[PDB]
Design an enzyme around this catalytic site. Structure first.
Site, PDB file in Angstrom:
ATOM      1  N   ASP A 102      94.270  19.279 -75.836  1.00 33.29           N
ATOM      2  CA  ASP A 102      93.790  20.640 -75.996  1.00 33.29           C
ATOM      3  C   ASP A 102      93.611  21.305 -74.631  1.00 33.29           C
ATOM      4  O   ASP A 102      93.666  20.659 -73.582  1.00 33.29           O
ATOM      5  CB  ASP A 102      92.477  20.650 -76.780  1.00 33.29           C
TER       6      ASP A 102
HETATM    7  C1  LIG Z   1      73.208  25.607 -69.885  1.00 34.31           C
HETATM    8  C2  LIG Z   1      74.469  26.405 -70.212  1.00 34.31           C
HETATM    9  C3  LIG Z   1      74.435  27.049 -71.598  1.00 34.31           C
HETATM   10  C4  LIG Z   1      75.762  27.718 -71.957  1.00 34.31           C
HETATM   11  C5  LIG Z   1      76.081  27.648 -73.449  1.00 34.31           C
HETATM   12  C6  LIG Z   1      77.155  28.632 -73.898  1.00 34.31           C
HETATM   13  C7  LIG Z   1      77.305  28.635 -75.417  1.00 34.31           C
HETATM   14  C8  LIG Z   1      78.387  27.674 -75.901  1.00 34.31           C
HETATM   15  C9  LIG Z   1      78.894  28.019 -77.300  1.00 34.31           C
HETATM   16  C10 LIG Z   1      80.091  28.968 -77.271  1.00 34.31           C
HETATM   17  C11 LIG Z   1      80.731  29.139 -78.646  1.00 34.31           C
HETATM   18  C12 LIG Z   1      82.176  29.629 -78.553  1.00 34.31           C
HETATM   19  O1  LIG Z   1      83.024  28.898 -78.171  1.00 34.31           O
HETATM   20  S1  LIG Z   1      82.602  31.329 -79.028  1.00 34.31           S
HETATM   21  C13 LIG Z   1      83.995  31.285 -80.192  1.00 34.31           C
HETATM   22  C14 LIG Z   1      84.926  32.463 -79.922  1.00 34.31           C
HETATM   23  N1  LIG Z   1      86.089  32.422 -80.790  1.00 34.31           N
HETATM   24  C15 LIG Z   1      87.110  31.401 -80.620  1.00 34.31           C
HETATM   25  O2  LIG Z   1      87.009  30.585 -79.768  1.00 34.31           O
HETATM   26  C16 LIG Z   1      88.331  31.376 -81.534  1.00 34.31           C
HETATM   27  C17 LIG Z   1      89.621  30.826 -80.935  1.00 34.31           C
HETATM   28  N2  LIG Z   1      89.301  29.853 -79.908  1.00 34.31           N
HETATM   29  C18 LIG Z   1      90.188  29.684 -78.773  1.00 34.31           C
HETATM   30  O3  LIG Z   1      91.165  30.351 -78.691  1.00 34.31           O
HETATM   31  C19 LIG Z   1      89.862  28.663 -77.681  1.00 34.31           C
HETATM   32  O4  LIG Z   1      90.579  28.979 -76.521  1.00 34.31           O
HETATM   33  C20 LIG Z   1      90.208  27.237 -78.119  1.00 34.31           C
HETATM   34  C21 LIG Z   1      91.142  27.244 -79.325  1.00 34.31           C
HETATM   35  C22 LIG Z   1      88.920  26.509 -78.485  1.00 34.31           C
HETATM   36  C23 LIG Z   1      90.888  26.490 -76.975  1.00 34.31           C
HETATM   37  O5  LIG Z   1      92.267  26.696 -77.077  1.00 34.31           O
HETATM   38  P1  LIG Z   1      93.265  25.858 -76.070  1.00 34.31           P
HETATM   39  O6  LIG Z   1      92.454  24.898 -75.237  1.00 34.31           O
HETATM   40  O7  LIG Z   1      94.275  25.085 -76.882  1.00 34.31           O
HETATM   41  O8  LIG Z   1      93.990  26.828 -75.168  1.00 34.31           O
END
Ligand SMILES: CCCCCCCCCCCC(=O)SCCNC(=O)CCNC(=O)[C@H](O)C(C)(C)COP(=O)(O)O
Ligand SMILES: CCCCCCCC/C=C\CCCCCCCC(=O)OC[C@H](COP(=O)(O)OCCN)OC(=O)CCCCCCC/C=C\CCCCCCCC
Ligand SMILES: CCCCCCCC/C=C\CCCCCCCC(=O)OC[C@H](COP(=O)(O)OCCN)OC(=O)CCCCCCC/C=C\CCCCCCCC
Ligand SMILES: CCCCCCCC/C=C\CCCCCCCC(=O)O[C@H](COC(=O)CCCCCCC/C=C/CCCCCCCC)COP(=O)(O)OCCN
Lengths: 110, 88, 459, 84, 128, 274, 124, 175, 104, 70, 63, 178
Positions: B43
């Site tokens: 990934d």
């Molecule tokens: C102490 C620090 C605290 C910080 C915490 C921050 C909060 C964390 C939680 C965040 C939640 C989310 O991800 S927010 C969710 C937002 N929506 C999406 O992620 C939909 C599509 N996802 C993608 O496209 C990505 O890149 C993916 C497929 C995973 C990768 O793909 P590849 O790799 O194949 O390229």
């Protein structure tokens, strides 16, 4: 007469020799750090004597050697105070500096 | 400093060593030229974590724009060699 | 005194009869010889003065300025040797003639037994420097700078002529000895107030006083290197010398007429120093630092105490030497980059290390580091002002702080950091420039060993 | 004279997660159905001479045994010499 | 929900917290594309002038010249006497002068009164 | 004013040093706290004691900085304590030198720092002075013990955290000799100097028992509390930092505003009004 | 501490203020009034030139200690007995100061008790 | 040393107590001082004697300049310039002399303070009193004259001081 | 100028400027050696409130401690020869009022 | 001026016996010094002169009369 | 040999020059080099004059 | 650094950067390695839950609250590598970097030392002299009209041709020259 003044001024005098030699050939070689460290160690071991004399008796002196200028009723002259504080702080400072330069001969090799 | 002059062989060996410690990828399947997304089915998060491990291994961090397009071990070694200016 | 004037006059036929490729060598050699001869004037007495003749005399205040004026000319020639390479021989001879005439006028100005002769020569000096600025100037604003420099001084100095002739008609003489010995108090009258203003404004406009200093950054930016040298070292001290001489007849009015000017300086030496923090031009920065230092000298002169006078004399000498050194450095950078902006050439210590050392020493001198004579004058004036009023120290302290800041700013922006990539015409420093800087700096540290030569007649 | 000795790395199969706090970490991770992908990488941190730690009091008390023995010997000699 | 971060003049809003970057329109993409286009043209011309072995000088930067000229010599021709500028100039150029004058006049008058009254104890005050 | 300024200096600097993560910054704040303590000594009219503390602080602070620099040089110019772990066995001489220096710094009796710091505490506790200042120096001593424990715990006790390539080596006679000279100094020089100089102040002969040991009591209290707090980092619990902790990390926000608000408000004027 | 709490939390007038102490005549307690003695004279104390704050009632032990320190210089730990005597004399001076503190405290107590008793008698 | 007058710069006997060793341990101070003489004080004295004899081979003298008293400003006509010049020069020389007198008193005070050690507050009362008197005299003579000081201004200051003193004395007598 | 991208290949890496781009009027104010406006983990108002509160509380507590001091249960120190009148200042021709110390 | 020690790559660094024995010797010296000083100089920490309790003093020496004479 | 030539050219020559300068020029003028008065304790003897300091008042010694 | 930037940042790239930065700051918070690994796998678990989300509106609404929450809990003193733009040795060696062209100003006495190096230097100079003349024409014929649209440079396509604008990239001083 009274080696206290002679030795106390000699330490400061010999602390300045490598500054004058900074234009000589030794400054362009790699032996200069050892030269300065040796000079500092000699200054410390020389300064150890007036502290011993004070410890034995309690000798204190003011040396007003060079008269810089006179401004009406004020007189500005090169005067060194060699009381307890000076004769005690000089050996400690020279010891600390000698250790620091010996350490730096390793830390700052590159 | 007293830092030994590490070479391309050393850098490639380290990269393959850390990659082999990654259980998600098979030690036999991986090659110097093996791609992550296609040849290993990883990934994007796996790639960013691999970049994290490389950064931690070698003591310097790769900027994100340069790391995101670092997709294979040979170009990882090439990027590290270019960044650190190692001859052979 | 003729033993100094006559060789300076003979410098002109020597220059005009010299070979087409030997003018610089003979000019420098004989200027240095004249400086060596003028070194004899430093021998002073605790008594009145060395009254050579009915027309000229010397004092412990005129001696340092005369020695500095005579020492300046070889340095100006070495500075101007570079940028005049593609000039016709006649025009180079004209330039050297202008420099020699300016030195001669200053030499006979600083002796000046009589006030009208002093005014005549002090106004005659305006012509050679104006021609230098408006003729051998790089920029198109040199004409406006020349007009400003001429008209500020002429407007200030025209009432001085009326005041001086009125003095001669009432008292009967303008000889300085008779003026000092037959001095009388000035009554509190409107006529005397305008007398004071006329006598003071002519010199205060040339210091320059804050608010009357608009001409100085222009005349410094648009002038060539020799013009900036001479106008920063000696031509600023003409106002201080004039006030030091003329204040003997303005008492006791000066006790309360000095209030408007003191404030203008006490605040001004702050304001201009702050101006130095935000400047994109080296020459403008050094010009504003000069304005700040001369404002402090104005305060010292207006306080009118012995320590104030000695501090003012020492500060005048030290500021002249340091300012000329700084302008030499800036011109050396300009002759490589041709830009005269601060942010273009950066990281020069990586390329020119000895020039970096010269920059550091010049900045330390400008920073007023002990035991340099800069700090001697600064401290004497600060103490005298403290005695004048305990609150002044606050302003003084602030200025000192700000001073150091901008000095190190000028050291850090130009010499530290990462070199600019696209400037690759930075040739190694010549021996001529390094010799110029050494000849600038060694006299300062030598005078530090014998301060009594520059502490004025009140020492 | 520098460090050109052609150092060779150990084998990757030597490092094993068991016997280190990473074991408890992966057990907790499996308790939520998760697994560490890089657990074996840092196992060397707990394998060799680093496997043994020292408490703060023990670290402060580094050379007390030899010093205490020397003090006992010295005080015994002092007692046997002064009592003469 | 977490406590909000309030940006100030001396502590600006982080680029990641700007709602504007999330409001995406084709106009914004076009604007960013032409921004990078002009940036790329400037970089291309700078690099072309920079890598040429024939040049042995300083690359004249029109932006630097414009900045310096605007800082130094373009103030007065664009200066118009307005109530704001007149009031600010009067304040910042006259207020401090009269304020320091009042302070020092009061101090010196008090000192002179004490001297005339004789109660100042100026012993050992030799240098002045 | 001198006493109050010293008290605020020492407490503020100890509070800052409590949570710092760079070793050099931690020792810098330790030095600032020691200087504040010396100024406190100046305030209660004990100048010779302050000079003696100058002499002792020279020795052990110089050794502490030397040991720190040796560690940085051994870890490829790495200064953060998060990326340095178990050095207690990997570099024993540096560990023992730092341990002795920290013991002397914290007022371990019959050491170099004892003869100065203990007398400072005694004299400030037995003088007609501020109660707030007294509380302040006591809390400062506790925090000194606390940050010394922090240094030792995070630099020598845990598991290693540096990059796999191990370049650890002290086998250089220059460094060993330089460290050992100041180490002998920090063991014996306090006793030697205290026993050799003539008396300079009226001693405090009689003390209440609880007030006599207050220095040692606050020292061990700081040691125990700091050790307990650093022991909880092993727990598998993650909690966001408290408001008080944040204030301590940014140095009371003094560097931020005092390096942004005034300078700007000057420079703008220097361009606009000036 | 307890006296600080007793002063700043209790009754301020109940306890004396060390700034203005003593507030009572020295003969109010008993008429004996033996005078404290000095061993070292003015001239020899000035020659020994200890310090102005070191010229106290225990100065003779200090002079003896300085004599020992100057005499047996190489052995900086010989004359320990005299340091003990000097510390003992300082300790005696300190306990005399504490006795003073307690005496004025109880005298203030009895004075306040007299004020209260006289007020109660006058009220009745 | 005969290079300076002892009465102008008075100094105490400063008797020093004889050594009284209490223990058998030899103090290294005496060995260090003896080797100091043997290695420094002998060649220095030899070279000084050589230089002194070389100077004795060629001896020549220089004299202190004497100045004759001249009529001062109080016996000078209003516009007579020559006697005014002489009076001004004489007044300036007197001014320098008083400055050096104050310098001598200040040097005496500083030497007393350092010499008496920590008994200076009681053992330098005489020097403090002399310095106070000399400072008062100098301040009365020469203070507030200004940068352009001259004999006439000092005379005017002295005359107004006599006016104040005479008026105060008359008022006190007639009180 | 501090908060500009540190990874972009600028023509002037130290000042983080590009050749030919418009220059801020106050560039010399932000040159990474002077005032910077980079975002901070805590908001400006919160930091100012916290520091001002800490300093104000500290000054108030110091003043209160001045009002309520700390000392020991002892009387004033006794000095023999009329509180050392002769060695403190002097004036030996005045015969000051004698002060005798109380022995307990 | 030292000897050659090669890197280890996740292996504990070799330690010269000289540094081991020097560190152990100096730690032992520090502990011995502390113990010896505490044995010989115990009053430097625990004090020497007992603190008297003011309340235990009898009213005879404090000049207190049985509340009636004055 | 290097240590000896160092101790000669870096210690002995400066101390010789300083001793000469202080002994024959600095001390030629008054009050330039002034010394703290040595402490006098009871029972001592003075080399210059020879008198002895009388003892003290035999303080009551106990504990 | 080496890679030319894009006109904008994609949502995938932004979320990758948030993951990288949050993981680094969490590592800074959890000093020990095992605790770091535990909370890092937890972080990945809470990170990939919305991996399969489809619509753009909710995805854009996400990664925003996450950024705010990270900002509140960002460990105001993170760990920075020594050579990083915030580390303890970011620009330590910038004072030892010296341009190549200064060697054009060396005195012939100094040029006498190191003769082979300077012969190679003249060879490099002649190679650059020819390659630049080729590169100007290659770039003008390659560039789209109206100005370049991105700051990406094309490679060499002929046999003896060299990449355009290569001299000041190849001849970097060094990382640690002295
Ligand atoms: C102490 C620090 C605290 C910080 C915490 C921050 C909060 C964390 C939680 C965040 C939640 C989310 O991800 S927010 C969710 C937002 N929506 C999406 O992620 C939909 C599509 N996802 C993608 O496209 C990505 O890149 C993916 C497929 C995973 C990768 O793909 P590849 O790799 O194949 O390229
Ligand atoms: C009164 C002083 C007035 C302040 C003068 C301001 C000078 C303006 C020009 C200064 C130049 C600007 C400058 O130096 O840059 C700011 C520079 C960089 O910030 P860093 O924290 O280092 O960031 C590094 C990480 N990137 O920071 C500074 O050095 C600015 C420091 C200004 C200090 C001003 C505050 C002083 C307040 C004094 C109060 C205490 C009074 C005395 C108390 C003692 C008891 C008697
Ligand atoms: C070196 C090798 C040569 C060795 C042979 C020489 C050995 C010593 C013999 C020297 C003879 C003594 C001598 O030089 O004469 C004294 C002569 C002073 O002359 P006077 O007129 O008496 O007083 C000054 C007012 N005019 O002393 C000297 O010049 C030499 C000693 C000066 C001290 C050294 C000064 C170094 C510092 C430079 C000044 C620094 C700035 C000022 C500091 C301000 C401090 C308040
Ligand atoms: C940067 C430009 C500055 C230019 C100079 C500014 C100062 C101007 C000085 C005043 C101008 C006239 C000076 C006259 C020369 C002095 C002679 C004198 O004082 O004699 C007075 C004469 O005084 C005058 O006549 C002066 C009158 C002024 C006329 C011209 C006015 C010019 C403008 C005045 C206001 C501005 C002055 C200050 C400007 C500050 C700089 C901006 C006494 O003469 P009697 O009549 O014989 O005595 C009376 C008893 N029987």
């Amino acid at each position: 007469m009274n080696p206290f003044a002679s030795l106390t001024l000699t330490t400061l005098t010999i602390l300045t020799i490598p500054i004058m030699m900074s234009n000589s050939n030794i400054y362009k070689t790699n032996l200069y750090p050892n030269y300065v460290k040796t000079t500092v160690s000699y200054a410390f071991t020389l300064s150890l004597v007036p502290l011993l004399m004070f410890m034995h008796t309690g000798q204190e002196m003011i040396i007003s050697n060079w008269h810089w200028m006179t401004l009406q009723t004020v007189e500005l002259s090169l005067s060194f105070k060699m009381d307890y504080f000076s004769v005690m702080f000089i050996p400690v400072a020279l010891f600390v500096t000698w250790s620091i330069m010996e350490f730096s001969m390793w830390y700052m090799h590159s | 400093s007293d830092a030994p002059p590490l070479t391309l062989e050393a850098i490639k060996d380290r990269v393959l060593y850390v990659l082999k410690l990654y259980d998600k990828i098979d030690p036999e399947k991986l090659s110097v030229n093996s791609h992550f997304m296609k040849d290993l089915g990883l990934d994007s998060l796996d790639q960013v974590e691999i970049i994290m491990a490389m950064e931690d291994e070698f003591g310097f961090e790769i900027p994100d724009i340069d790391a995101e397009k670092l997709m294979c071990p040979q170009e990882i070694v090439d990027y590290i060699a270019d960044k650190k200016d190692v001859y052979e | 005194m003729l033993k100094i004037i006559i060789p300076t006059t003979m410098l002109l036929p020597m220059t005009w009869m010299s070979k087409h490729n030997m003018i610089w060598i003979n000019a420098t050699v004989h200027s240095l010889l004249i400086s060596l001869i003028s070194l004899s004037l430093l021998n002073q007495l605790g008594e009145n003065s060395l009254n050579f003749s009915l027309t000229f005399f010397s004092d412990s205040l005129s001696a340092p300025l005369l020695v500095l004026t005579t020492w300046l000319l070889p340095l100006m020639l070495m500075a101007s040797q570079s940028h005049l390479s593609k000039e016709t021989t006649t025009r180079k001879k004209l330039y050297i003639t202008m420099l020699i005439l300016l030195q001669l006028f200053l030499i006979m100005t600083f002796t000046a037994t009589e006030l009208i002769l002093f005014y005549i020569l002090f106004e005659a000096t305006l012509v050679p420097t104006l021609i230098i600025i408006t003729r051998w100037g790089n920029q198109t604003e040199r004409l406006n700078a020349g007009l400003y420099f001429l008209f500020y001084t002429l407007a200030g100095s025209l009432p001085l002529l009326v005041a001086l002739v009125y003095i001669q008609n009432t008292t009967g003489s303008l000889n300085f000895l008779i003026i000092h010995y037959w001095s009388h108090p000035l009554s509190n009258s409107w006529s005397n107030i305008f007398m004071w203003l006329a006598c003071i404004m002519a010199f205060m406009v040339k210091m320059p006083l804050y608010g009357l200093h608009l001409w100085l950054p222009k005349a410094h930016v648009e002038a060539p290197i020799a013009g900036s040298m001479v106008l920063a070292a000696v031509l600023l001290k003409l106002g201080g010398y004039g006030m030091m001489r003329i204040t003997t007849i303005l008492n006791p009015l000066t006790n309360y007429m000095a209030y408007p000017f003191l404030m203008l300086s006490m605040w001004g030496m702050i304001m201009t120093s702050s101006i130095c923090l935000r400047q994109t031009d080296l020459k403008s920065l050094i010009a504003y630092s000069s304005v700040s230092h001369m404002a402090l000298v104005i305060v010292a002169i207006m306080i009118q105490t012995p320590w104030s006078f000695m501090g003012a004399t020492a500060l005048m000498i030290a500021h002249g030497l340091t300012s000329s050194m700084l302008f030499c450095l800036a011109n050396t950078n300009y002759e490589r980059v041709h830009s005269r902006t601060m942010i273009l050439a950066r990281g020069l210590q990586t390329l020119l290390p000895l020039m970096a050392t010269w920059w550091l020493v010049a900045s330390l001198t400008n920073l007023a580091l002990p035991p340099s004579i800069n700090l001697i004058g600064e401290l004497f004036i600060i103490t005298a002002s403290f005695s004048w009023s305990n609150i002044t120290i606050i302003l003084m302290g602030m200025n000192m702080m700000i001073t150091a800041l901008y000095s190190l700013y000028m050291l850090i922006t130009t010499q530290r950091g990462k070199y600019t990539h696209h400037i690759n015409n930075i040739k190694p420093s010549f021996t001529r420039e390094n010799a110029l800087m050494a000849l600038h700096i060694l006299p300062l540290l030598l005078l530090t060993l014998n301060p009594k030569m520059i502490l004025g007649p009140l020492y | 004279e520098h460090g050109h000795s052609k150092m060779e790395l150990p084998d990757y199969k030597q490092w094993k997660i068991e016997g280190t706090p990473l074991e408890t970490v992966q057990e907790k991770l499996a308790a939520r159905g998760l697994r560490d992908p890089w657990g074996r990488n840092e196992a060397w941190r707990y394998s060799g001479g680093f496997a043994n730690n020292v408490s703060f009091v023990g670290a402060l008390l580094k050379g007390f045994k030899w010093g205490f023995a020397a003090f006992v010997v010295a005080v015994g000699a002092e007692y046997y010499l002064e009592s003469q | 929900s977490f406590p909000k971060y309030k940006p100030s003049r001396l502590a600006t809003l982080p680029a990641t917290l700007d709602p504007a970057e999330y409001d995406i329109s084709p106009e914004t993409r076009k604007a960013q594309a032409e921004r990078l286009a002009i940036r790329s043209r400037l970089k291309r011309e700078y690099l072309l002038q920079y890598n040429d072995p024939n040049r042995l000088g300083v690359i004249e930067d029109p932006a630097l010249i414009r900045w310096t000229y605007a800082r130094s010599a373009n103030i007065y021709p664009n200066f118009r006497p307005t109530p704001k500028t007149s009031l600010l100039g009067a304040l910042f150029g006259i207020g401090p002068l009269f304020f320091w004058y009042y302070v020092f006049k009061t101090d010196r008058d008090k000192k002179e009164k004490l001297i005339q009254e004789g109660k100042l104890d100026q012993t050992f005050n030799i240098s002045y | 004013m001198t006493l109050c300024l010293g008290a605020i200096t020492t407490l503020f600097t100890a509070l800052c040093a409590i949570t710092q993560n760079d070793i050099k910054k931690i020792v810098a704040f330790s030095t600032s706290s020691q200087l504040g303590l010396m100024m406190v000594t100046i305030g209660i009219n004990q100048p010779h004691l302050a000079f003696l503390h100058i002499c002792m602080h020279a020795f052990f602070k110089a050794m502490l900085f030397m040991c720190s620099g040796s560690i940085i040089h051994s870890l490829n110019d790495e200064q953060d304590i998060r990326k340095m772990g178990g050095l207690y066995k990997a570099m024993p001489f540096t560990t023992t030198a730092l341990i002795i220096g920290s013991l002397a710094l914290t007022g371990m009796p019959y050491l170099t720092g004892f003869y100065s710091k203990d007398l400072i505490i005694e004299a400030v506790n037995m003088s007609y002075t501020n109660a707030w200042a007294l509380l302040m120096t006591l809390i400062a001593t506790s925090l000194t013990a606390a940050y010394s424990t922090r240094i030792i715990f995070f630099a020598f006790l845990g598991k290693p955290r540096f990059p796999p390539l191990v370049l650890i080596n002290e086998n250089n006679p220059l460094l060993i000799n330089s460290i050992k000279r100041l180490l002998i100094g920090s063991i014996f020089a306090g006793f030697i100097i205290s026993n050799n100089i003539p008396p300079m102040t009226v001693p405090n002969t009689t003390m209440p028992l609880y007030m006599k040991m207050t220095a040692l009591i606050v020292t061990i209290m700081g040691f125990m509390l700091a050790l307990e707090l650093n022991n909880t980092t092993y727990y598998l619990k993650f909690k966001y930092p408290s408001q008080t902790y944040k204030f301590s990390n940014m140095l009371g926000y003094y560097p931020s505003i005092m390096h942004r608000l005034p300078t700007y408000h000057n420079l703008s004027m220097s361009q606009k009004s000036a | 501490g307890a006296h600080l709490a007793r002063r700043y939390l209790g009754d301020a007038s109940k306890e004396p203020d060390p700034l203005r102490m003593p507030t009572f005549p020295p003969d109010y307690g008993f008429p004996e009034r033996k005078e404290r003695e000095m061993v070292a004279t003015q001239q020899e104390m000035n020659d020994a030139q200890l310090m102005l704050q070191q010229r106290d009632y225990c100065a003779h032990y200090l002079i003896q200690l300085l004599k020992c320190k100057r005499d047996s210089f190489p052995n900086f730990l010989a004359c320990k007995h005299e340091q003990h005597d000097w510390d003992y004399c300082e300790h005696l001076d300190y306990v005399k100061r504490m006795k003073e503190f307690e005496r004025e405290r109880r005298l203030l107590q009895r004075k306040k008790r007299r004020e209260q008793r006289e007020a109660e008698m006058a009220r009745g | 040393p005969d290079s300076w007058d002892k009465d102008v710069y008075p100094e105490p006997p400063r008797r020093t107590p004889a050594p009284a060793p209490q223990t058998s341990l030899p103090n290294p101070v005496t060995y260090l001082t003896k080797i100091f003489d043997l290695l420094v004080d002998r060649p220095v004295t030899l070279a000084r004697e050589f230089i002194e004899q070389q100077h004795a081979k060629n001896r020549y003298y220089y004299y202190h300049r004497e100045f004759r008293r001249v009529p001062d400003i109080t016996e000078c006509e209003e516009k007579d310039i020559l006697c005014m010049f002489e009076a001004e020069m004489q007044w300036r020389r007197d001014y320098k002399v008083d400055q050096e007198i104050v310098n001598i008193i200040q040097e005496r005070l500083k030497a007393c303070q350092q010499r008496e050690g920590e008994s200076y507050r009681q053992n330098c009362a005489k020097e403090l009193e002399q310095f106070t008197q000399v400072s008062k005299a100098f301040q009365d003579r020469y203070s507030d004259l200004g940068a352009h000081y001259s004999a006439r201004k000092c005379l005017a200051k002295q005359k107004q001081r006599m006016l104040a003193e005479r008026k105060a004395a008359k008022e006190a007598a007639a009180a | 100028q501090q908060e500009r991208d540190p990874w972009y290949d600028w023509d002037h890496p130290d000042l983080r400027l590009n050749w030919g781009e418009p220059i801020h009027w106050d560039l010399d104010m932000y040159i990474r050696n002077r005032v910077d406006t980079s975002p901070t983990p805590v908001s400006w108002n919160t930091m100012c409130k916290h520091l001002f509160g800490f300093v104000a509380f500290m000054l108030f507590m110091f003043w209160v401690g001045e009002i309520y001091p700390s000392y020991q249960p002892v009387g004033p120190k006794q000095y023999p020869y009329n509180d050392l009148y002769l060695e403190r200042g002097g004036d030996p021709t005045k015969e000051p009022e004698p002060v005798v110390h109380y022995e307990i | 001026g030292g000897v050659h020690i090669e890197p280890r790559y996740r292996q504990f660094p070799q330690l010269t016996r000289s540094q081991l024995i020097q560190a152990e010797f100096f730690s032992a010296t520090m502990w011995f010094w502390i113990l010896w000083r505490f044995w010989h100089d115990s009053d430097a920490v625990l004090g020497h002169f007992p603190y008297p309790d003011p309340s235990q003093w009898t009213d005879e020496e404090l000049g207190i009369l049985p509340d009636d004479e004055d | 040999y290097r240590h000896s030539i160092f101790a000669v050219t870096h210690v002995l020559i400066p101390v010789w020059i300083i001793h000469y300068y202080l002994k024959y020029h600095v001390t030629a003028k008054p009050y330039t080099v002034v010394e703290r008065k040595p402490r006098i304790f009871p029972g001592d003897t003075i080399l210059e004059t020879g008198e002895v300091i009388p003892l003290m008042k035999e303080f009551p010694d106990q504990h | 650094a080496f890679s030319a930037p894009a006109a904008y940042l994609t949502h995938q790239q932004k979320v990758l950067r948030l993951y990288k930065r949050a993981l680094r700051h969490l590592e800074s918070w959890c000093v020990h390695r095992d605790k770091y690994r535990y909370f890092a796998c937890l972080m990945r678990a809470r990170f990939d839950e919305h991996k399969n989300e489809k619509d753009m509106v909710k995805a854009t609404q996400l990664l925003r609250q996450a950024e705010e929450e990270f900002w509140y809990g960002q460990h105001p003193q993170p760990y920075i590598f020594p050579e990083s733009p915030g580390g303890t040795s970011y620009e330590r060696y910038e004072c030892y970097k010296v341009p190549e062209w200064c060697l054009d100003d060396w005195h012939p006495s100094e040029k006498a030392m190191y003769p082979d190096y300077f012969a190679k230097r003249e060879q490099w100079k002649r190679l650059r002299r020819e390659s630049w003349e080729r590169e100007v024409k290659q770039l003008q014929e390659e560039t789209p009209p109206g100005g370049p649209r991105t700051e990406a440079l094309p490679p060499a396509r002929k046999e003896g041709d060299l990449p355009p604008l290569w001299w000041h990239i190849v001849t970097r001083p060094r990382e640690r020259p002295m």
